[PDB]
Amino acid sequence: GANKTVVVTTILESPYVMMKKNHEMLEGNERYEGYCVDLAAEIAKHCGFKYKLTIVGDGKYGARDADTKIWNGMVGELVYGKADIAIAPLTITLVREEVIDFSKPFMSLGISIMIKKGTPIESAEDLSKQTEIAYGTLDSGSTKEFFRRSKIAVFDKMWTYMRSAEPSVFVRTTAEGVARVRKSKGKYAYLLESTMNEYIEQRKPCDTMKVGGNLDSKGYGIATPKGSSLGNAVNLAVLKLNEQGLLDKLKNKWWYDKGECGS
Amino acid sequence: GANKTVVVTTILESPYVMMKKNHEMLEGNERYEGYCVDLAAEIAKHCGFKYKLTIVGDGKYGARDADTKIWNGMVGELVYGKADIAIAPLTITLVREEVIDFSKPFMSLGISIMIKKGTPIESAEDLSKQTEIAYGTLDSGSTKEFFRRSKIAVFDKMWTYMRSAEPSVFVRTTAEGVARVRKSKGKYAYLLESTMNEYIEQRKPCDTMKVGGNLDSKGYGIATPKGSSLGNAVNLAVLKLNEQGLLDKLKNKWWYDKGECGS
Ligand SMILES: N[C@@H](Cn1c2c(c(=O)[nH]c1=O)CNC2)C(=O)O
Ligand SMILES: N[C@@H](Cn1c2c(c(=O)[nH]c1=O)CNC2)C(=O)O
Ligand SMILES: [Cl-]
Ligand SMILES: [Cl-]
Ligand SMILES: [Cl-]
Ligand SMILES: [Cl-]
Ligand SMILES: [N+]
Ligand SMILES: [N+]
């Protein structure tokens, strides 16, 4: 059949996808800006397709309910055919790779610790040994799942702590986790992907810091339904953009070129 | 048909694959040790196959001759059906991904600079602006090809320098590049994968250093012939080993646990 416009699913998460300040004046894909907006355009240019950016209906990345076996989030949109491709800060994981296809990584990352400046914490082990400084994750997604599933002693101890800590240590959004770090006078540390930690460290009021080594070594990938023809071309496009240096330029653009916390 | 023993191709490169000191007493896969030997065993355990380790006949990673269109190295062994899987420090690249399949990365790496301690160089830009300190790469493989193909101004200038520098700045093996750094009194710097640089920095006589940021962000992958059934299972195995923390333990084992240059 004839070519059809490709339906892209993504999520509003700065600096990946944001509504432009003047979005009300605009229409279609032009309403949005960010790293993943630019990445989508570069992939589409290389692969020769037209596309429509859509925002995932349920605000989730992708997990399977143990009872109903239903997949939610952007992964679910692909599984059920509601989108053709997901272009987002979506972690490549085994359980997702069993049900959708991922490109090779377009970013590298790992779980990391965000502190308010001056907090006396340098590592996950430091957090795990104490309770005065509370710590947690998003309430959905791969960071939470890392702790829930870990059999590594330190991380399993951290999960047991997080499940039982009061008040709740989980947050609904990145913005909520960052604000909680900023408002808690050093008594909350936030476990989040290193990419996001690095971005926030260069945002005013310049009161957060990434500390410690990353806890793991993962990647974000572009996702397509299993067996999708688009998958081969998109994978090769990611590799080409990486090899040309364009992914490095794009991260610099959205993370550092307009950093707010000095040179 | 019945299951058959899987033919693995690999390459002798420390610390990935080495003949054991007592190899003459041993036979079969037990003759070898290293990171990729252990990785092969872990993948085979998870996927449930028996295998034979073989050493790539031509000593190469994988490139295509522009005239004959023939693929050499471990990639070629897969393309031509002489091996079933390659388990080695083999970089995921676009041109290889067009002809073979790669798992998701089992290691992350980028091109990096090795100096003799005390050499007044901190970056690729520093190298590119001068000629007193000579610099080069392996004479085959992805590091050389990065420079040959780069359209980035600094790296293209470095390639033009390397092609014309005298005496030749290229080396045949990692051991030769390391020895050249060690023997050249600061007048040779070696461009090599960060993984190898990190390994050598913890080897006696403890006279080399990794300097500067990495020039790129890549991965090593396990390779199979295009469309091979083994590919899906091996990809999921890599993801599982990563998610269990086993790849991190394996790098620590072969890089740092017996490092020779202190704690
Ligand atoms: N990439 C994850 C989702 N996610 C994200 C952040 C995080 O700190 N933790 C997390 O889990 C920050 N941006 C996305 C997934 O794919 O579930
Ligand atoms: N991974 C490369 C081969 N290679 C290697 C090293 C290097 O410094 N440069 C390079 O090119 C060190 N160990 C392998 C490929 O796949 O061609
Ligand atoms: Cl259409
Ligand atoms: Cl927004
Ligand atoms: Cl057999
Ligand atoms: Cl050896
Ligand atoms: N997949
Ligand atoms: N491939």
Measure the CA–CA gap between B201 and B17, rounded to whole angstroms: 18
Task: Compute the distance between CA of residue B216 and CA of residue B194 in angstroms, rounded to an integer.
Answer: 10
Nearest CA among A122, A138, A71, A73 for reference residue A99: A71
Nearest to B16 by CA among B250, B216, B261, B258: B250
Decide: B80 and B71 in contact? Cβ < 8 Å.
yes
Q: List phi, psi (to 5°) of B149.
A: -95, -10
Using the 8-state DSSP alphabet, how is residue A71 labeled? B
The long-range contacts involving B241-245, CB below 8 angstroms and separated by at least 24 positions, are B241/B39, B241/B42, B241/B43, B241/B46, B241/B106, B242/A216, B242/A217, B242/A218, B242/B104, B242/B106, B243/A93, B243/A94, B243/A149, B243/A216, B244/A151, B245/A150, B245/A152, B245/A216
Answer whether B234's CB lies under 8 Å from B106's CB.
no
What does the DSSP assignment read for A108-160?
EE-EEEEEETT-S--SHHHHHT-SSSEEE-BSSSHHHHHHHH--SHHHHHHHH
Contact A136, A263 (CB under 8 A): no
Interface A-B: count of C-beta contacts within 8 A: 64
User: What's the distance, Cα to Cα, between the start and end of chain A in Å?
Assistant: 53
B79, B71 Cβ separation under 8 angstroms: yes
CA angle (B58, B105, A39) in 5-degree steps: 120
The pairing of beta strand B51-55 with beta strand B6-10: parallel
Phi, psi of A180 (to 5 degrees): -65, -40
CA of A81 to the centre of ligand 7 (A): 15
Which residue has 């469309």 as its token pair? B227
* DSSP H/E element including B75: helix B73-79
Torsion angle (degrees, nearest 10) of CA A160, A163, A165, A170: 130
Residue with tokens 């059934």: B229
- Alpha helices for B116-152 (secondary structure H): 124-128, 142-149
Residues of B in contact with A108 (CB under 8 A): 108, 217
Dist. CA A54–CA A47, nearest whole Å: 19
Q: Which two tokens stand for residue A80?
A: 């059920």
Residue B171 φ then ψ, to 5°? -130, 155
Q: How far is CA B188 from CA A49, B157, B213, in A?
A: 47, 17, 19
CATH top class, domain B113-211: alpha beta
**Residue B259 contacts residue B202 (beta carbons within 8 Å):** yes
Q: Pick from B145, B149, B112: which is nearest to B127 by CA?
A: B112
Burial B8-24 (b: 16+ CB within 10 A, else e): bbbbebbbbbbeeeeee
- Per DSSP (E only), the strands in chain B are 6-10, 18-19, 32-33, 51-55, 85-86, 100-102, 107-109, 111-116, 134-136, 188-193, 208-211, 218-220, 223-225
The contact set of B with A (CB < 8 A) is 92-94, 97-98, 102, 104-105, 108, 149-152, 216-219, 235-236, 239-240, 242-245, 247-248
Give the SS3 label for residue A211: strand
Nearest CA to ligand 1 atom 6: A193
Based on the number of CB atoms within 10 Å of its own CB, is B81 exposed (0-12), middle (13-18) or buried (19 or more)? Answer: exposed
Backbone angles phi, psi at B116, to 5 degrees: -70, 135
Tell me which of B104, B222, B252 to substitute to probe the interface with A (most A C-beta atoms closer than 10 Å). B104
Q: At CA B236, angle to CA B231 and CA B239, rounded to 5? A: 130
What Å resolution does this PDB entry report?
1.2
The answer to whether residues A217 and A89 touch, using CB atoms and an 8 Å cutoff, is no
Burial label, B262 (beta-carbon count in 10 A; 0-12, 13-18, 19+): exposed
Phi, psi of B18 (to 5 degrees): -140, 145
Q: At residue A126, what are phi and psi to the nearest 5 degrees?
A: -55, -50
Instruction: Show the beta-strand stretches assigned E in chain A.
Output: 6-10, 18-19, 32-33, 51-55, 85-86, 100-102, 107-109, 111-116, 134-136, 188-193, 208-211, 218-220, 223-225
**Best substitution site from A11, A17, A58, A91 to test ligand 1's pocket, by max atoms within 8 Å of Cβ?**
A91
Q: Which of A74, A77, A112, A114 is nearest to A92 (CA)?
A: A74
**CA distances from residue B94 to A55, A169, B73, B82, B219 in whole angstroms, order as listed:** 30, 43, 16, 22, 12
DSSP state of A103: P
Tell me if the bond preceding A205 is cis, omega within 30° of 0: yes
Count CA within 13 A, CB hemisphere, residue A89: 22
| Exposed/middle/buried for residue B77 (C-beta within 10 Å: 0-12, 13-18, 19+) | buried
